[PDB]
Amino acid sequence: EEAVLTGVATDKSEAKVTVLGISDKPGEAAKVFRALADAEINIDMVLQNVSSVEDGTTDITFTCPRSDGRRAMEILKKLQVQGNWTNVLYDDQVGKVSLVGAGMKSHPGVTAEFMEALRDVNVNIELISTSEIRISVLIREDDLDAAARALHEQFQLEAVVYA
Amino acid sequence: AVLTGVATDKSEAKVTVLGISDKPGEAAKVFRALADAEINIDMVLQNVSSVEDGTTDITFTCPRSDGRRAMEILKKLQVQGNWTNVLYDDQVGKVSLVGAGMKSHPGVTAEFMEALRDVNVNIELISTSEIRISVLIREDDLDAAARALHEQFQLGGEDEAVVY
Numbered sequence: 001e002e003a004v005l006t007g008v009a010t011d012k013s014e015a016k017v018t019v020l021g022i023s024d025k026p027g028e029a030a031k032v033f034r035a036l037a038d039a040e041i042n043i044d045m046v047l048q049n050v051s052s053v054e055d056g057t058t059d060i061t062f063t064c065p066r067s068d069g070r071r072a073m074e075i076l077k078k079l080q081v082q083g084n085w086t087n088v089l090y091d092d093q094v095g096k097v098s099l100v101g102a103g104m105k106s107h108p109g110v111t112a113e114f115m116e117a118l119r120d121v122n123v124n125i126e127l128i129s130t131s132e133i134r135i136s137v138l139i140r141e142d143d144l145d146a147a148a149r150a151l152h153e154q155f156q157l158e159a160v161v162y163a
Numbered sequence: 164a165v166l167t168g169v170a171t172d173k174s175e176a177k178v179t180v181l182g183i184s185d186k187p188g189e190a191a192k193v194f195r196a197l198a199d200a201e202i203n204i205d206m207v208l209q210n211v212s213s214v215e216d217g218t219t220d221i222t223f224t225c226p227r228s229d230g231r232r233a234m235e236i237l238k239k240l241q242v243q244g245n246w247t248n249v250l251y252d253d254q255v256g257k258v259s260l261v262g263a264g265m266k267s268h269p270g271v272t273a274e275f276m277e278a279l280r281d282v283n284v285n286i287e288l289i290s291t292s293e294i295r296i297s298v299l300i301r302e303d304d305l306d307a308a309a310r311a312l313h314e315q316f317q318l319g320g321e322d323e324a325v326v327y
C-alpha cells in the first residue's frame with residue numbers, strides 16, 4: 001500500500017541530444033533510432049512528448065554516454081539535412097538525478113515533494129521521466145549536489161516509507 | 164539483452180499542460196495540485212523547453228476516471244502560470260516492452276519503433292529507460308502494436324524470457 005524510497009542516484013556521465021521538429025506520423029521515430037542503433041549509440045533514456053498544437057511536429061530527446069555524444073550528433077546532423085527536421089541540439093553538461101523506489105503510483109505526494117525539494121534549492125528541472133521504479137530529472141550537472149542533498153532531506157533518506 | 168514481456172494498459176487518460184515557464188517551481192505547482200486532489204500519477208514526461216519561448220509542456224497519465232478532473236484542477240492554475248492550455252485525452256493506450264540490458268543494445272529501441280511503424284501505428288509519446296520501453300498510442304491501436312511487438316521480439320504470452 002505504501003510507497004517505499006530506496007535511494008537517490010546521480011549520474012554525470014551522460015549527454016543529451018534533442019532532435020527538433022519531427023513530423024508526427026508513423027516511421028519517424030524508427031528513422032532516428034535505426035540510425036543510432038546502427039551506430040551503436042548506447043541509449044539510456046528516450047523522451048518524446050505529444051506533438052505541438054501549433055505545428056503538429058514534436059521533439060525527441062535521448063541521453064547516452066558522453067563518449068557516444070559526438071558520434072550521435074554526426075549521424076543525426078546528416079539525417080537532419082536530408083529530411084524536414086528543424087535542428088538537432090547537443091548538451092554534454094547535463095546531470096541526471098533520480099529518486100528510486102517502489103509503489104509511487106498511488107502516492108502523488110512523492111512526485112509533488114520531489115519537485116518542491118528541487119524548487120527550494122533553485123534547481124531548474126529541464127526534463128522529467130518516470131518509470132515503475134524511479135522519478136528522474138535532467139538538470140545542470142553543477143546542480144547535482146544541491147539536488148541529491150535536497151532529495152535526501154525531503155524524504156529523510158537507507159530505505160524509507162513515504163510519510 | 165533479454166526481453167521478458169509486452170505490457171498493455173487501456174485504463175489511463177493523459178493530460179498535458181502546455182506552455183509552462185521553464186523556471187524553478189513551476190512543476191511543483193502542477194504536482195502539488197494533483198497530490199492535494201489525490202489523483203494517482205502513473206507516468207510523467209517533460210521534454211526540453213524551446214529556446215525562443217522559454218516554455219515547455221508536461222504530460223502525465225492517471226486513471227481514466229480522474230483525467231477530466233485532473234485537467235480541470237490544473238486549469239485553475241493556467242492564468243497565474245501563463246500557460247497556453249491544459250488538454251485531456253481519454254482514448255490513450257500504453258504499450259511497453261520489458262527486459263534487461265537494453266542500454267547496451269540500442270537495436271531493441273530501433274526494433275520497437277520499426278515494429279509499430281510496420282503496423283502503421285503512430286507513436287504519440289515515448290518514455291524509456293533501461294528496464295522498459297513505453298509509448299502512448301491511440302487505444303484503438305493497442306492490439307496491433309502489442310501483437311507486432313510479440314512478433315518482433317519473439318515473445319509469447321507466458322512471460323518466458325527470450326534473449327535478444
Ligand SMILES: C[C@@H](O)[C@H](N)C(=O)O
Nearest residue numbers: 025026027028029286
Ligand atoms: C514522432 C514519431 O514518434 C512518430 N509519431 C512515429 O510514430 O514514428
Ligand SMILES: C[C@@H](O)[C@H](N)C(=O)O
Nearest residue numbers: 125186187188189190
Ligand atoms: C517546467 C518545470 O519543470 C520547471 N523547469 C521547474 O523546474 O519547475
